[PDB]
Scaffold this active site. Structure first.
Site, short mmCIF file in Angstrom:
data_model
loop_
_atom_site.label_atom_id
_atom_site.label_comp_id
_atom_site.label_asym_id
_atom_site.label_seq_id
_atom_site.Cartn_x
_atom_site.Cartn_y
_atom_site.Cartn_z
N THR A 266 0.89 -1.21 0.29
CA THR A 266 0.03 0.01 0.05
C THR A 266 0.86 1.10 -0.01
O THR A 266 0.73 2.27 -0.62
CB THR A 266 -0.94 -0.20 1.14
OG1 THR A 266 -0.26 0.35 2.34
CG2 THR A 266 -1.64 -1.61 1.14
N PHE A 391 -7.53 6.64 3.91
CA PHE A 391 -7.10 5.63 5.17
C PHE A 391 -8.52 5.19 5.92
O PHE A 391 -8.19 4.74 7.02
CB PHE A 391 -6.18 6.53 6.20
CG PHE A 391 -4.93 6.92 5.58
CD1 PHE A 391 -4.08 5.85 5.23
CD2 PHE A 391 -4.65 8.17 5.23
CE1 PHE A 391 -2.60 6.34 4.80
CE2 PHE A 391 -3.52 8.43 4.54
CZ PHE A 391 -2.47 7.56 4.55
N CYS A 398 -6.96 3.41 9.08
CA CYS A 398 -5.89 2.87 8.96
C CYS A 398 -4.97 3.11 10.10
O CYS A 398 -4.79 4.25 10.53
CB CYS A 398 -5.08 3.38 7.60
SG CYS A 398 -3.38 2.63 7.48
C1 HEM Z 1 -0.29 4.69 1.69
C2 HEM Z 1 -0.43 3.68 2.59
C3 HEM Z 1 -1.81 3.25 3.33
C4 HEM Z 1 -3.06 3.34 3.02
C5 HEM Z 1 -3.44 4.20 1.76
C6 HEM Z 1 -3.94 2.46 3.74
C7 HEM Z 1 -5.02 2.36 3.90
C8 HEM Z 1 -5.90 1.61 4.67
C9 HEM Z 1 -7.27 1.63 4.72
C10 HEM Z 1 -8.07 2.23 3.64
C11 HEM Z 1 -7.73 0.74 5.71
C12 HEM Z 1 -9.27 0.68 6.20
C13 HEM Z 1 -9.58 -0.86 5.71
C14 HEM Z 1 -11.11 -1.15 6.09
O1 HEM Z 1 -12.03 -0.34 6.00
O2 HEM Z 1 -11.30 -2.49 5.54
C15 HEM Z 1 -6.71 0.51 6.44
C16 HEM Z 1 -6.69 -0.34 7.51
C17 HEM Z 1 -5.34 -0.72 8.21
N1 HEM Z 1 -4.05 -0.39 7.98
FE1 HEM Z 1 -3.68 0.68 6.25
N2 HEM Z 1 -2.92 1.91 4.85
C18 HEM Z 1 -1.66 2.37 4.41
C19 HEM Z 1 -0.32 1.89 5.17
C20 HEM Z 1 -0.57 1.17 6.22
C21 HEM Z 1 0.58 0.60 6.90
C22 HEM Z 1 2.25 0.97 6.54
C23 HEM Z 1 0.32 -0.12 7.98
C24 HEM Z 1 1.05 -0.82 8.90
C25 HEM Z 1 2.43 -1.04 8.82
C26 HEM Z 1 -1.04 -0.23 7.80
C27 HEM Z 1 -1.90 -1.01 8.67
C28 HEM Z 1 -3.21 -1.01 8.64
C29 HEM Z 1 -4.01 -1.91 9.72
C30 HEM Z 1 -3.51 -2.70 10.82
C31 HEM Z 1 -5.31 -1.55 9.34
C32 HEM Z 1 -6.50 -2.13 10.02
C33 HEM Z 1 -6.84 -1.05 11.24
C34 HEM Z 1 -8.00 -1.58 12.16
O3 HEM Z 1 -9.14 -1.93 11.81
O4 HEM Z 1 -7.89 -1.67 13.45
N3 HEM Z 1 -1.50 0.68 6.70
N4 HEM Z 1 -5.53 1.05 5.74
#
Ligand code: HEM
Ligand code: HEM
Ligand SMILES: O=C(O)[C@H](Cc1c[nH]c2ccccc12)NC(=O)C(F)(F)C(F)(F)C(F)(F)C(F)(F)C(F)(F)F
Ligand SMILES: O=C(O)[C@H](Cc1c[nH]c2ccccc12)NC(=O)C(F)(F)C(F)(F)C(F)(F)C(F)(F)C(F)(F)F
EC number: 1.14.14.1
Lengths: 453, 453
Positions: A266, A391, A398
């Site tokens: 991502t 995010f 996120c």
């Molecule tokens: C440009 C970079 C990134 C984008 C665009 C992004 C986008 C997202 C989005 C849209 C979600 C929500 C998913 C949903 O509703 O089903 C999410 C959840 C998450 N992202 Fe990212 N993400 C990015 C980078 C990262 C990074 C670097 C990490 C960890 C090293 C990360 C860890 C997570 C985690 C753990 C969740 C779940 C959060 C929860 O529900 O408690 N993300 N991300």
């Protein structure tokens, strides 16, 4: 009142529309034709795709809707388990892990990760400094080397050493292949057909590879007792203030797998898109490069200098507006409710938020939504609530947002400090879809400005 | 006196003895059985293998014998042309290139290359600093990354970027495959057999890859006029004092190809053998490490510091004694002469000097010739003339001797400064032969001493 619906294939309803290498881009085209909401049916399943800010703002009300696991995430759950990304909000391990890890992902925590981010960033720059005259850069390949290595190092003090390789690390081979399989399961009619037996066997073999490396990483750190200030240390030691419980070792594995997926898929895409837009819009590149030159005055950037890169931030946000790299998320109705005054939903009904479409909502952004204009984010309070969601939403947004933006700002800033860039091939945007979006085959030339590190 | 001779195979004479994976080690065993000289016949040709200092001191008399192109070198000449290594002494291009290049390969010339040598050496040390706890080093593979990159950068300001790859550079793949075909052509009956048409096509294709890259490098440099101050610059500008002529562009290419063969094959073997003998001799390793720690007091080693690594130099010479990595050279008699007061030779008769056997001459070295004892080289002057010839003889001696030794000393010094080494597999020496010797499969673990660069 009849909700719009795309073309059908008899008994299979809309399902074969997802039998494509580019399903999200296909859904975007359908959204352009059908508008702010359409129903999508398959045998035994229905969802509604939302594209407008006015409907999506309601969908984002956490008293009415909660995060749903899309079929894609249910398959990713076979290797990401009840990690943060693939757990339900009501599962005990979600709030537990969320409470434990939130402090480790805060803006303040980024001060601690900064030094290790720089380590990998410097490796990238050194790679590019060392290319010969007319050689080029394979952009998403190198951004992926960077982002995966950063989360490996920052998170668990593990070095994937991706800049030392053409063939990825064995864990990554399995993860990439596991992800591919998870996304491929969505688009095959009759998934029990004998042909798919080998795919299923390889899947189980890839899951085992992931578990065994990560379990070993966890066991090793337990057996060494070393207090390396990282995510793994935090997870082995930390307790959820609410339950008073720590994460068990199985859930820790699931979180690590989840962070590695995130770091690979991502953040690399964001950097790749940002560079794509920069080379297609050289006035923007000029403004970003000038800021980088004015701000990053030392050979090793500081945390404080990265915070100062406002325009580079704006570039990253505009790249996220156009191509949010994890482009859809799913919700379910907690109770019977009516969406937008018009569409009645029953308890459990599912919604899909099409983020790229939300971000092209002309009633919010104006008619020029396809143009790359970072100044859209120059005075960000101008952006309505729930209009910009790269995010995700609310408590299920996120966790890695600050991590990703810090890394991306640092790296993009260094890239623009150290090199001029040429779109030598006049690259035609071609977006590959995995768990995420990336500009496949994007190549550039980078001419060094010869500023020492 | 009838010259000893190993077993024959009817009309094939001794030829099948070289139809083996390990022909030099085979010849060494034969030397053990037969002594200081043996005849070796094949259909249509004869040579004599010398193994004693007593006889080799006569062979090294340049009034009596000149360098011959062995069959092996004749085949290498198909891609190395009339470069220094594969030219006859009487060829105008040999003497021109010799006079032009020799002063650029002096010990004092190494001051100019030192910075670029440090560039590659630091990449090696950083690779090893970046390995995770459980991981190991593939020694010859990494030594070859280093030595190829060093001659590329020092010689021609070209970066093969070997530490960024698993797949060797296209040039290297072709060169390696070219050298392999040269080796294979030796043990082969009828060369124009249609069976070998594909081998010949591949060979020609590899020559093309090599010429195309190198010619481009040369042309690129000529255009820019950029005085990069490396071997290529010297070669483009330099005039032979004798004739007053410069080298032409074709010959410059052959010199570059020749330098790349040299820096790939022989030099990395030296470092690999040295590390092998160090891990097999912990007391010697400790003494060398003490010196490295005492002398290399700066994060960047200086030229003068490398010259002070006396014991490391002794270690390298002792590795060269046991396993000289280009293990044989060929001579021909300039006139009728009698060798050893016993063996009359006619003008044109050929000799092979079997260097590893010369280096095991018990009349020079004492009975313990298999033991690794760098102390033999406490005073290198003490060694009698023509007893130690890892760099060949006289005006046809290795032009790259000082380059190779400076690079190897620097690198081994840094390795011994920065890491403790473990022979974790109790490696069993297995020497692979191409046109050079290497310890195949040699692996170690390196534990960092955590001294920054
Ligand atoms: C440009 C970079 C990134 C984008 C665009 C992004 C986008 C997202 C989005 C849209 C979600 C929500 C998913 C949903 O509703 O089903 C999410 C959840 C998450 N992202 Fe990212 N993400 C990015 C980078 C990262 C990074 C670097 C990490 C960890 C090293 C990360 C860890 C997570 C985690 C753990 C969740 C779940 C959060 C929860 O529900 O408690 N993300 N991300
Ligand atoms: C451990 C490293 C090395 C060893 C053991 C070695 C050994 C030798 C030997 C034995 C010869 C004599 C060949 C013969 O009589 O047929 C030779 C010649 C030569 N070597 Fe090396 N060499 C080494 C490294 C290098 C390097 C690094 C270069 C160049 C960058 C180089 C360039 C040459 C050239 C040009 C010749 C031909 C000299 C002439 O006849 O004018 N060598 N080497
Ligand atoms: O996985 C899901 O549940 C939904 C839609 C879906 C998949 N199967 C269905 C059957 C009936 C109704 C809807 C569906 N999948 C998608 O929207 C998609 F097209 F695969 C998708 F957009 F690519 C996606 F999976 F959501 C995504 F964008 F790749 C992901 F990154 F996972 F969000
Ligand atoms: O290339 C040559 O001419 C000689 C001798 C030779 C090769 N074929 C022959 C037939 C009859 C008599 C002698 C020979 N070759 C060798 O001595 C050899 F040691 F086997 C060799 F391995 F081929 C070798 F080429 F000398 C070498 F050792 F690999 C080399 F590195 F080239 F010095």
């Amino acid at each position: 009142k009849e909700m719009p619906q795309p073309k059908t294939f008899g008994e299979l309803k809309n399902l074969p529309l997802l039998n494509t290498d580019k399903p999200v881009q296909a859904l975007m085209k359908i959204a352009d034709e059908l508008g702010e909401i359409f129903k999508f049916e398959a045998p035994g399943r229905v969802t509604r795709y939302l594209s407008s800010q006015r409907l999506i703002k309601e969908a984002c009300d956490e008293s009415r809707f909660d995060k749903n696991l899309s079929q894609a995430l249910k398959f990713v759950r076979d290797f990401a388990g009840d990690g943060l990304f693939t757990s339900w909000t009501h599962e005990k391990n979600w709030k537990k892990a969320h409470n434990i890890l939130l402090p480790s992902f805060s803006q303040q925590a980024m001060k601690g990760y900064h030094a290790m981010m720089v380590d990998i960033a410097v490796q990238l720059v050194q790679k590019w400094e060392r290319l010969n005259a007319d050689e080029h850069i394979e952009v998403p390949e190198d951004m992926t080397r960077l982002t995966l290595d950063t989360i490996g190092l920052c998170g668990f003090n593990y070095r994937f050493n991706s800049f030392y390789r053409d063939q990825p690390h064995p864990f990554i081979t399995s993860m990439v292949r596991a992800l591919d399989e998870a996304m491929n399961k969505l688009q095959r009619a009759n998934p029990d057909d004998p042909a798919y037996d080998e795919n299923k066997r390889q899947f189980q073999e890839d899951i085992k590879v992931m578990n065994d490396l990560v379990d070993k990483i966890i066991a090793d750190r337990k057996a060494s007792g070393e207090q390396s200030d990282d995510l793994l240390t935090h997870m082995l030691n930390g307790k959820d203030p609410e339950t008073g419980e720590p994460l068990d070792d199985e859930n820790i594995r699931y979180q690590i797998i989840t962070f590695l997926i995130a770091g690979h898929e991502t953040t690399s895409g964001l950097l790749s898109f940002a560079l794509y837009f920069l080379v297609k819009n050289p006035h923007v590149l000029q403004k970003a490069a000038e800021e980088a030159a004015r701000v990053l005055v030392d050979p090793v950037p500081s945390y404080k200098q990265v915070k100062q890169l406002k325009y580079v931030g704006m570039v990253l946000n505009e790249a996220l507006r156009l191509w949010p790299t994890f482009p859809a998320f799913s919700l379910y109705a907690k109770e019977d409710t009516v969406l937008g005054g018009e569409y009645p939903l029953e308890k459990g009904d599912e919604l899909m938020v099409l983020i790229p479409q939300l971000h092209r909502d002309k009633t919010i952004w104006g008619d020029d939504v396809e143009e790359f204009r970072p100044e859209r984010f120059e005075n960000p309070s101008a952006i309505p609530q729930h209009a910009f969601k790269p995010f995700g939403n609310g408590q299920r947004a996120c966790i890695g947002q600050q991590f990703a933006l810090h890394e991306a700002t640092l790296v993009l800033g260094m890239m623009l400090k150290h090199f001029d860039f040429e779109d030598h091939t006049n690259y035609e945007l071609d977006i590959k879809e995995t768990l995420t979006l990336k500009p496949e085959g994007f190549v550039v030339k980078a001419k060094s400005k010869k500023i020492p590190l």
